[PDB]
Design a protein around this ligand. Structure first.
Ligand SMILES: [Mg+2]
Ligand SMILES: [Mg+2]
Ligand SMILES: [Mg+2]
Ligand SMILES: [Mg+2]
Ligand SMILES: [Mg+2]
Ligand SMILES: [Zn+2]
Ligand SMILES: [Zn+2]
Lengths: 97, 176, 162, 222, 38, 45, 131, 68
RNA sequence: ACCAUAGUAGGCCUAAAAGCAGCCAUCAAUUGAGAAAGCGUUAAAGCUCAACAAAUUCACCAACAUAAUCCCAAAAACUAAU
């Protein structure tokens, strides 16, 4: 959550996280949620909304992030680890923006 | 640009320190705030300095939230004393009962900090008691008759000790 | 062994985890009660820098050591295997475990000096100009002291400095 | 989540007045007029006196032998006095003020002509003697931290120890010597004069057992 | 950079690194905390 | 013991066993016991 | 391995076990909501907006909450607590009122829960609400 | 301001309720003896507050040697 | 990695001592956070520590430049050595 704060999230439009709480594989995506939801990252820009989509049946956890490059970054955490998602997020959404 | 905690007396707001260095550094009008603060605090004739939260904005404008006055004052008046103990707990400053702390509590339950907290009055009374411990002020369960027997003894002992401390402070001011 | 795939399609980027098949521990160990992976195969004090078939099992496709809590090695043996892996890289064994870089294969350097049993890294070692006489003598390290417990069939202790 | 542990509490610690270290004098009040020969034998070998704790739970322990002159006393006094909480800690000298006269000649003298004159005084310290003893309501760790400085600036090698630390290293010292795999020990060979080795050894060795050599003491020596 | 016999971190931001067969202390915040073990 | 497993939105067609045996025990009654039932429910609620 | 060194229950562990045992008894609605990093101001405000409908919030360590819950009748909530979490306690529940405040904050998800012995996902809470 | 309260003045400057009006909690609270560690029951929640506080004091004393 | 809100600028002396010149108490809200262990301020504000929660490979100490004609045997980690 700190490495996201240092990186100036203001280049982002909308961040949603779609996941399924009763699956065994979702801990990673959750960790991502609480990393982006933190006060530092949340207050870097007020133009960005963070939406948590919670469903029992969907069965596939997902993270979708739009930003003002006209870019859409969608990472499906299934077997992906938390800090791999956050590193991918950092190098992807910072270097472009 | 941030927030400011200012503990200020009832009818007294003046365009000099602390308000001059503090508010004047933020780029905020001192006179507008003296005006508003005095508007709101001239209606308290109880003469109680209140800690207040001044939100100072990016555009140099501001907002103000007045809270309940300090427990230090409420207890200074509850014991009827002036200044608190020099060495606290080693010596006594003034005396109080259940009733004092209860009143002071239900007065301060509407404070900004204790407002959001749903805590009962027993909690707030615990806090005020603890704040009495360090002010040099002693609680007692039922003291009333012994409250006054005390005050006629205790006040004479506090006069004796404050006069002895004033004299020894004159001797230590002379020796220095 | 879980590969992470990244795709770029029309200003949308997909990143996904994908699981492949991991080979499994060979069916029947000699010392099943044994705790640590080296030990239950009776390889303690036996493997050297020279034994690649063993070493290549703990490392990454890019040549770096695997972490300890994943592998399960007894701490001591982890360090030994790390020494050995370094020493074996330097010795020019495991040529497939380097990172692949299409540009840098082209620019030849003086043909690799053949070396083996090298404890330090080549770039870090000052030439010893002063040697020194019979009584105060500068000795050149060979192999690592972590392996000084390997079984000696000759009976003479391995010579770690010349 | 982590579960807590009961904190060590000192209800039994009684702090004496003047907890800080006494000033010690450069020269004794009755200066020795008669010039003494130098026993080096008073630095040599293990220590008999001051081996144990008295009041305090912490100490500086001398691993070598050495001479302590006034400079060292000064150093320890200042360094410890401003490094301690006078409320919660007290310190104590386990070593006497320097009493032993040490001579010199003016640089540039030829050999002979007599003894020299008394330059200064020192204190003999045999290996294994407590230099300074600190007690208090302290845990060992703070005291250790700043005591190791002092220990380090002493002429002999030295350590900061507690009661626990000291008995730890003593039990370890004897346990190492009943564990020993090789049949051949310094004691065993020396006493029985095997290989006529007594020719090369000093008599004192019989007591020292090859643990002490000159003023030096190696703890690893069984 | 100073050559020292003992390395010690002079603040929380110092980190400790082995390069060229030596130990080093690098510090990003205070470069004056730089140290090289001799 | 253990509790329910919480089926949800995409597919849940499944109604409880209790409701069904209740509407069955309701459907097996003659209309005098249906009027008795109706009175005993009208009074309590 | 060396022989087995059984660890012993502290007073803290027993106090938490008792407390959670009471918590699952008393409140009719226990709603698991993933704990999310907020300002102290906003957390206080949320606590106070829960004080207005009288709903209470509680937080326990996963350490002592997990085995209690796997030995509980409630074990189907085990996959919910793997991350951070916050336990929403309600006596004499009204769910639409709990959903009202969570609606204000979009990044603060309500995951599982049990309302009067009925174990539900978020959709089950949405269903119980409109009722 | 300044107020000298006697049994006439402490009652005349205050509205002081009867003894049957005041809550039970107000008498139970310990006036001057702050509680110790041995006194409290290890199965009580407050005991562990005190133990935490003491642990913090301990870490605080041990951290006196910080170079940083 | 993570996170920081409450009486409250605790009572004093001082131009000011707001956790942090000094002296004395060291209580108290919250699941949880010292009347504060380091930095910082004129007094603050502000950074971190210990606290919850989150997790958990292992982690006590140990490192030290040099000379004068030209370095100074060559070399070497295993085929069995009381
Ligand atoms: Mg020395
Ligand atoms: Mg508390
Ligand atoms: Mg912390
Ligand atoms: Mg040099
Ligand atoms: Mg030669
Ligand atoms: Zn092993
Ligand atoms: Zn630094």
């Amino acid at each position: 959550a700190a490495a996201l704060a240092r990186l100036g999230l203001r280049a982002v439009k909308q961040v949603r996280v779609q996941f399924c709480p009763f699956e065994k594989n979702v801990e990673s995506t959750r960790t991502f949620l609480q990393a982006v939801s933190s006060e530092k990252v949340r207050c870097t820009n007020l133009n960005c909304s963070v939406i948590a989509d919670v469903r029992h049946d969907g069965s596939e956890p997902c993270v979708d992030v739009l930003f003002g490059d006209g870019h859409r970054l969608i990472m499906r955490g299934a077997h992906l680890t938390a800090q791999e998602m956050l590193t991918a997020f950092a190098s992807h959404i910072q270097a472009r923006g | 640009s941030g927030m400011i905690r200012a503990i200020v007396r009832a009818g007294q707001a003046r365009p000099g320190p602390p308000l001059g260095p503090i508010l004047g550094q933020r780029g905020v009008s001192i006179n507008q705030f003296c005006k508003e603060f005095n508007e709101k605090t001239k209606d308290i004739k109880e003469g109680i300095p209140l800690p207040t939260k001044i939100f100072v904005k990016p555009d140099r404008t501001f907002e103000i939230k007045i809270g309940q006055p300090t427990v230090s004052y409420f207890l200074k008046a509850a014991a009827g004393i002036e200044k608190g103990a020099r060495h606290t707990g080693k010596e006594v400053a003034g005396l109080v009962t259940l009733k004092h702390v209860y009143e002071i509590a239900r007065v301060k339950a509407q404070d900004d900090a204790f407002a959001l907290q749903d805590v009962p009055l027993s909690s707030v009374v615990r806090s005020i008691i603890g704040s009495a411990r360090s002010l040099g002020i002693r609680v007692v369960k039922d003291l009333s008759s012994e409250e006054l027997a005390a005050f006629q003894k205790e006040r004479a002992l506090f006069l004796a000790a404050q006069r002895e401390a004033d004299l020894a402070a004159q001797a230590e001011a002379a020796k220095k | 062994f879980r590969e992470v795939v990244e795709i770029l399609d029309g200003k949308t980027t997909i990143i996904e985890g994908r699981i492949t098949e991991t080979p499994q521990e060979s069916p029947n160990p000699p010392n099943p009660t044994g705790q640590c992976p080296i030990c239950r195969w009776n390889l303690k004090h036996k493997y050297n820098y020279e034994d690649v078939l063993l070493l290549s099992q703990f490392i990454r496709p890019h040549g770096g050591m695997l972490p300890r809590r994943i592998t399960g090695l007894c701490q001591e043996e982890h360090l030994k295997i790390e020494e050995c892996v370094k020493m074996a890289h330097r010795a020019g064994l495991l040529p497939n475990h380097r990172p692949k870089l299409p540009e840098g294969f082209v620019p030849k350097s003086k043909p690799r000096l053949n070396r083996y049993l090298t404890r330090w890294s080549p770039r870090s070692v000052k030439p010893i100009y002063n040697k020194g006489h019979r009584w105060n003598k500068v000795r050149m390290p060979v192999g690592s002291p972590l392996l000084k417990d390997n079984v000696s069939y000759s009976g003479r202790p391995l010579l770690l400095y010349h | 989540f982590k579960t807590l542990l009961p904190v060590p509490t000192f209800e039994d610690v009684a702090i004496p007045e003047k907890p800080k270290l006494r000033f010690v004098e450069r020269v004794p009040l009755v200066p020795k007029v008669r010039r003494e020969r130098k026993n080096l034998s008073d630095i040599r070998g293990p220590s008999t006196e001051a081996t144990e704790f008295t009041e305090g739970r912490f100490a500086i322990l001398a691993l070598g032998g050495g001479y302590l002159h006034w400079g060292h006393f000064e150093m320890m006094r200042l360094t410890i006095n401003r490094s301690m909480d006078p409320k919660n800690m007290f310190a104590l000298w386990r070593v006497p003020a320097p009493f032993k006269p040490i001579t010199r000649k003016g640089m540039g003298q030829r050999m002979g002509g007599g003894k020299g004159a008394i330059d200064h005084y020192v204190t003999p310290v045999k290996a294994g003697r407590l230099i300074v003893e600190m007690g208090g309501r302290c845990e060992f760790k703070e005291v250790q931290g700043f005591l190791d400085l002092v220990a380090h600036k002493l002429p002999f090698p030295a350590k900061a120890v507690s009661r626990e630390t000291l008995e730890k290293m003593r039990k370890d010292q004897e346990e190492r010597e009943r564990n020993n795999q090789n049949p051949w020990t310094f004691e065993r060979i020396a006493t029985a004069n095997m290989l006529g080795i007594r020719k090369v050894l000093s008599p004192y060795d019989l007591t020292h057992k090859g643990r002490y050599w000159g003023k030096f003491y190696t703890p690893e020596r069984v | 950079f100073k050559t020292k016999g003992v390395l010690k971190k002079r603040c929380r931001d110092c980190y400790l690194v082995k390069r060229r067969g030596r130990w080093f202390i690098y510090c990003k915040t205070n470069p004056k905390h730089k140290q090289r073990q001799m | 013991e253990a509790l329910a497993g919480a089926p949800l939105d995409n597919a849940p067609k499944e109604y409880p066993p209790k409701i069904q045996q209740l509407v069955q025990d309701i459907a097996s009654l003659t209309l005098l016991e249906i009027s008795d039932l109706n009175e005993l429910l009208k009074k309590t609620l | 391995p060396p022989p087995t060194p059984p660890q012993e229950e502290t007073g803290l562990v027993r106090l938490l076990r008792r407390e959670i045992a009471a918590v699952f008894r008393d409140n009719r609605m226990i709603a698991v909501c993933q704990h999310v990093a907020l300002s102290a101001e906003d957390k206080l405000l949320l606590r106070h907006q829960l004080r207005k409908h009288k709903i209470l919030m509680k937080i326990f360590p996963n350490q002592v909450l997990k085995p209690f819950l796997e030995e509980s009748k409630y074990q189907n909530l085990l996959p919910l607590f793997v991350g951070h979490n916050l336990l929403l306690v309600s006596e004499e529940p009204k769910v639409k009122e709990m959903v009202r405040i969570l609606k204000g904050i979009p990044f603060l998800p309500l995951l599982g829960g049990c309302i009067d012995d009925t174990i539900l996902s978020r959709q089950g809470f949405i269903n119980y609400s409109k009722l | 301001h300044a107020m000298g309260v006697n049994i006439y003045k402490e009652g005349q400057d205050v509205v002081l309720k009867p003894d049957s009006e005041y809550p039970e909690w107000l008498f139970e609270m310990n006036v001057g003896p702050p509680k110790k560690l041995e006194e409290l029951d290890p199965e009580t929640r407050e005991y562990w507050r005190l133990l935490r506080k003491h642990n913090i004091w301990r870490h605080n004393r041990l951290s006196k040697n910080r170079k940083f």
